[PDB]
Amino acid sequence: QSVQVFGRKKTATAVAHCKRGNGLIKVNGRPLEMIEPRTLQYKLLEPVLLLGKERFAGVDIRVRVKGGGHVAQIYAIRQSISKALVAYYQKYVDEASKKEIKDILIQYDRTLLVADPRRCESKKF
Amino acid sequence: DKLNNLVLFDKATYDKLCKEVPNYKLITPAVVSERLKIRGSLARAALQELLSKGLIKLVSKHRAQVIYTRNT
Amino acid sequence: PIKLARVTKVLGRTGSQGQCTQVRVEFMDDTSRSIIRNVKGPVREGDVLTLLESEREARRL
Amino acid sequence: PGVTVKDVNQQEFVRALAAFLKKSGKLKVPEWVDTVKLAKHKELAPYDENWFYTRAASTARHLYLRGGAGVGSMTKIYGGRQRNGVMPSHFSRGSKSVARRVLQALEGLKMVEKDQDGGRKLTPQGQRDLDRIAGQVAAANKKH
Amino acid sequence: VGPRLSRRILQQARQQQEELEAERERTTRLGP
Amino acid sequence: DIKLFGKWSTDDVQINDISLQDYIAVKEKYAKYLPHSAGRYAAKRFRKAQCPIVERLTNSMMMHGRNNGKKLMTVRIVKHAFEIIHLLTGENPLQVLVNAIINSGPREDSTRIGRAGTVRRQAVDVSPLRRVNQAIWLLCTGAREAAFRNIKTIAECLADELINAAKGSSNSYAIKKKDELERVAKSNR
Amino acid sequence: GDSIEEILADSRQRSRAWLKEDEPLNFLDPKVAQRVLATQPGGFKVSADGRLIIR
Amino acid sequence: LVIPEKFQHILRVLNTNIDGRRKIAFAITAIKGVGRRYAHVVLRKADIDLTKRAGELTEDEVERVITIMQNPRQYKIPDWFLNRQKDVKDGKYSQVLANGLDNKLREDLERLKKIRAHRGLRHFWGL
RNA sequence: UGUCCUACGCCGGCAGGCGCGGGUAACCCGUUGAACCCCAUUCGUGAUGGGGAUCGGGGAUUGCAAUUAUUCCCC
């Protein structure tokens, strides 16, 4: 059993696949804890810290990320992992955990589940 | 006016460094350079040497800012 | 003496360029006194001000 | 179960592979190693005197991550920003001869070979060596 | 989402599906 | 427990001034891991009172041209500032941050009016939002124009300015400019 | 074809798609194609009696 | 470390003063005719520690680095890397450093003045 | 955007030179390996390793032709 969700930012897109596993997190085939900017490392790590590593202990995810810049890619990744876990605990796990987890994410940060629809404006002749 | 920071250890400067730096509660290149009137690159070298002899504790390392402090 | 007092009603934008706000203010320590003041900055209902000289009441047409 | 290159810190991996290729000592070091700038947008010679081993280690890693890279691709990879005087800056590529000499030295060590559809790519034996040094990086870092 | 970003997302998800499904000379003679 | 930079707690943070409890947002809902959020705290009026205050410093250190847009540099700056101010003072950095914000915001300003040639100054009160904004701006200007041409880095000067405005000693830039503004306001009642 | 609005009408390019974002979009769901669209989402003088005037 | 007993604050090379309280790779550039690139290449050919300061070099080190800057072609410093590649009067590759740079500059100006080309006449009409 | 855009191979330190392929194009340049940014090194308040103007020498390239510096590269 597996799900596939996406998150976005200005142009950065992240596609996350969520399968039964043991708690290893892959983004572009690379581990979560080695993505280049360390100054935003906790911004990458907020869903795990808010939910605990025990909720991730029976699942694995792989995220392919394309577009954007460094920061936009990080935000798309965190939206992708949050939406992937919400979709998985909605589809194959009971709904009460999905609702309480969704409440935790949305009280901490709306952009963990709702896309920011801001993009560059066009210039007209 | 024009600063005349020393490019290398003088004898009295080295002794004063070795017995007055390890009690400051804040060790950065800038404070040692400003209050010892020494060039900041050699201040960094002296701080690295004091770290190498196991007498001063490093707190965080960066290319932009390095901070040390006392052991106890 | 420093005396603190809460905004109840903003009376409107005053000043030549509209740079100040005329506002209705009541004190917390004695919630009976009422004064009119001019403030600089954005003020909404519920803001609490610190007045250095809480004797005069300001005025502009 | 074996850790790959993509499983570790890249800077420590590059430094450890540079130490590996230095202690091997069988790369063909060019005669002009200490008299060149690595691109036309540079301002000084490289400050690390055995830069060739570092560049070869990074080159091997970059071919591991993406095959089919020629000399032009590696000049695009190491290109940077030329500050054109009082004129606006631009993107400038690297020097072609340095990338070519690194690739030919890696072929001379038999770590890298051509393919039929384009530029250079990794040999299986060099890939085994690269996985070995990656495991050494992971043991020296993640087990410490 | 809009055309361009959704197109990139769709092709990216398709490539991820194929790389999940992923994990000799041509037939030069007719008869064995 | 949500911690700034993984090692700084906001539970023991006590705000002293009654005027600013709604306008210095650092508590259990405004506690964040990092001063970077990509938040749209300026699309509507008074939304920036919900911005965490370290994000307001982080947004206000990106000044004078070259530093515009460089926020990761600024998150780094305030991080190193928190470490060095904790080492030099020995307590929670966020507490002397909110102390310097409270002690740096001017309580009585002067407005310039004029009709024709005659230009005079009238003393007026300040909003709490403007109090916090002016405190942040004066502290950032103090650190920035404090270093600018010396061996001391930006983080050390920011932490020293933050201490020097937290205790209110007159060697700080922000408390000097605030005292000057309060003096001209008292002279222009 | 037979809708009211189509009949009451005043009478590269085809590869464009619109996603929609609600539950998160599960691409592996068999019923996902319902949330992927193929098109862009989204005079007379009345008399005193109220009868319209036609000319 | 500490100051050596023979730390030279002032060096006198090629009829030109050198500030000894500096890195060697820029105290070389303190004179004319050598910038940062040629100083680095000279020091790498000479096999001198560039981390070392200028004031603590021995007499053998300063005489060998002076020797190498006078005859760089002999020490495999390439032809393209040199200051004067083809001297107009006597075609040969060299590196004019302290007074020879001024000599060749002013004699080139006198050569352009004698032939009355545009460049020399315009330069001397500029003052 | 492209019948001048260019992959790749060889030579030269660099501009550049030679050969051999793709592209009348969501097919090839191109998974457009951009810069700021991020991480380590040197620098230490110094008109200084900031700043590059203006010059001296040589090489290369586009043109019938580069002088009054076409443009680029090195010192």
Structure tokens at A71: 């920061």
Amino acid making up residue D27: L
Can you give the length of chain A in residues? 125
Q: What is the CATH number of domain H10-75?
A: 1.10.8.50
Q: Which 3 state secondary structure label does DSSP give F17? A: coil
Q: Where are the alpha helices (DSSP H) in H1-127?
A: 24-27, 36-46, 59-70, 100-114, 118-125
Q: Which 3 state secondary structure label does DSSP give G16? A: coil
Q: Which helix (H) or strand (E) holds D144?
A: none
Structure tokens at G36: 């992927």
Q: Do A30 and D6 touch (CB under 8 A)?
A: yes
Q: Do D35 and H77 touch (CB under 8 A)?
A: yes
Query: For chain E, percent helix, then strand, then coil, each to nearest 5?
Result: 60, 0, 40
**CA–CA separation, B48 and B68 (whole Å):** 10
Inform me whether the C-beta atom of residue F46 falls under 8 Å from chain C C-beta atoms: yes
Amino acid making up residue H52: K
Resolution (A): 3.1
Place of tokens 């560059």: A120
CA distances from F14 to F20, F30, F82, F95, H99 (A): 12, 14, 17, 7, 72
Torsion of CA D9, D14, D18, D19, to 10 degrees: -10
Closest Cα partner for F138 from F188, F85, F179?
F179
Beta bridge partners of F3: F9
CB A39 within 8 A of CB F76: yes
Report residues 71-90 of H contacting strand I, contact meaning Cβ closer than 7 Å: 78, 80-88
Closest Cα partner for D40 from D90, D105, D103?
D90
The 10 Å Cβ neighbour count of residue E14 is: 12
Contact between the CB of H125 and strand I at under 7 Å = no
Q: Which chains does H contact via 3+ CB–CB distances below 8 A? A: B, D
Beta bridge partners of A14: A7, A65
Q: Which 3 state secondary structure label does DSSP give E26? A: coil
**CA–CA separation, A86 and A89 (whole Å):** 5
Structure tokens at A113: 């589940």
CA distances from F163 to A94, F87, F168 (A): 52, 12, 8
**CA–CA separation, D135 and D127 (whole Å):** 12
What residues have CB less than 8 Å from D100, skipping those under 6 apart?
D71
**CA–CA separation, F91 and F98 (whole Å):** 13
Amino acid making up residue A84: A
Greatest alpha-carbon span in chain D: 55
- Provide the chain H residues 62-81 that lie in CB contact (below 8 A) with chain D: 77-78, 81
Domain count, chain B: 1
Inform me whether the C-beta atom of residue E3 falls under 8 Å from chain G C-beta atoms: yes
Q: Which helix (H) or strand (E) holds F187?
A: helix F173-187
- Provide the chain G residues 6-45 that lie in CB contact (below 8 A) with chain A: 21, 23-29
Structure tokens at C40: 């600089």
The 10 Å Cβ neighbour count of residue D129 is: 19
DSSP-assigned letters across all residues of C2-48: -EEEEEEEEEEEESSSS-EEEEEEEESSSTT-EEEEEEES---TT-E
Q: Do E15 and A11 touch (CB under 8 A)?
A: no
Q: How far is the CA of D100 from the C1' of I13 (A)?
A: 13
**CA–CA separation, B57 and B55 (whole Å):** 7
Breaks (C-N over 2.5 A) in chain G follow: 11, 21, 42
What residues have CB less than 8 Å from C61, skipping those under 6 apart?
C14
Q: Where are the domains of chain C?
A: 1-61
Place of tokens 């070298």: B45
The separation between CA F73 and the C-alpha centre of its own chain, rounded to angstroms, equals 18
Beta bridge partners of F25: F52
**CA–CA separation, G26 and G4 (whole Å):** 34
The 10 Å Cβ neighbour count of residue C14 is: 18
Domain count, chain D: 1
Q: Do A8 and E5 touch (CB under 8 A)?
A: yes
Backbone angles phi, psi at C49, to 5 degrees: -105, 155
**CA–CA separation, D119 and D71 (whole Å):** 8
Tell me the CA end-to-end span of chain E in Å, nearest whole number. Answer: 55
**CA–CA separation, B44 and B66 (whole Å):** 9
Place of tokens 């920036």: F48
Domain of residue B60, CATH code: 1.10.10.10
CB F137 within 8 A of CB F57: no
**CA–CA separation, E3 and G18 (whole Å):** 6
Q: Which helix (H) or strand (E) holds F179?
A: helix F173-187
Burial per residue of D23-57, b for 16 or more beta-carbon CB atoms within 10 angstroms, e otherwise: eeeebeebeeebbbebbebbeebbeeeebbbbbbb
CA distances from D136 to D8, D131, G28 (A): 10, 9, 39
Full residue range of the structural domain in which residue B71 is found: 3-72
CA distances from F38 to B55, F165, H120 (A): 42, 29, 62
CB A113 within 8 A of CB A101: no
Nucleotide nearest G15, from its CA to each C1': I26
CA distances from D127 to A43, D21, D25 (A): 34, 14, 19
Q: Where are the alpha helices (DSSP H) in F68-153?
A: 72-89, 93-104, 128-146
**CA–CA separation, B51 and B44 (whole Å):** 10
Q: Is the dihedral of CA D51, D57, D61, D67 positive or negative?
A: positive
Residues from chain B that touch F156, judged by Cβ atoms under 8 A, are: 28, 30-31, 65
What residues have CB less than 8 Å from H104, skipping those under 6 apart?
H84, H87, H96
Closest Cα partner for H95 from H81, H106, H80, H83?
H83
Burial per residue of F146-163, b for 16 or more beta-carbon CB atoms within 10 angstroms, e otherwise: bbeeebbbbbbbbbbbbb
**CA–CA separation, D64 and D124 (whole Å):** 11
CB F35 within 8 A of CB F57: yes
CB D136 within 8 A of CB D9: no
To the nearest whole angstrom, how far is the Cα of B33 from the nearest Cα of chain F?
Answer: 8
Tell me the CA end-to-end span of chain C in Å, nearest whole number. Answer: 28
Which strands sit side by side in the sheet containing A59-66, from one edge to the other?
Answer: A2-8, A13-20, A59-66, A25-27, A30-31
Inform me whether the C-beta atom of residue G5 falls under 8 Å from chain E C-beta atoms: no
- Provide the chain C residues 21-60 that lie in CB contact (below 8 A) with chain F: 37-44, 46-53, 56, 58
The domains of chain F, with CATH numbers, are 3-187 (1.10.455.10)
What residues have CB less than 8 Å from B25, skipping those under 6 apart?
B69, B70, F87, F88
Q: How far is the CA of H42 from the C1' of I16 (A)?
A: 27
Q: Name the residue among G24, G28, G29 with its Cβ closest to that of A83.
A: G24
Cα angle F122, F128, F134 (rounded to 5 degrees) comes to 75
Can you give the length of chain H in residues? 127
What residues have CB less than 8 Å from H29, skipping those under 6 apart?
H35, H36, H39
CB D63 within 8 A of CB D122: yes
**CA–CA separation, G37 and D140 (whole Å):** 52
Q: Is the dihedral of CA C28, C32, C38, C44 positive or negative?
A: positive
Greatest alpha-carbon span in chain G: 61
Full residue range of the structural domain in which residue D12 is found: 1-144
Name the structure determination technique. Answer: cryo-EM
**CA–CA separation, D92 and D70 (whole Å):** 17
What residues have CB less than 8 Å from H1, skipping those under 6 apart?
B8, B9
Place of tokens 């007993």: H5
Structure tokens at D94: 């690297």
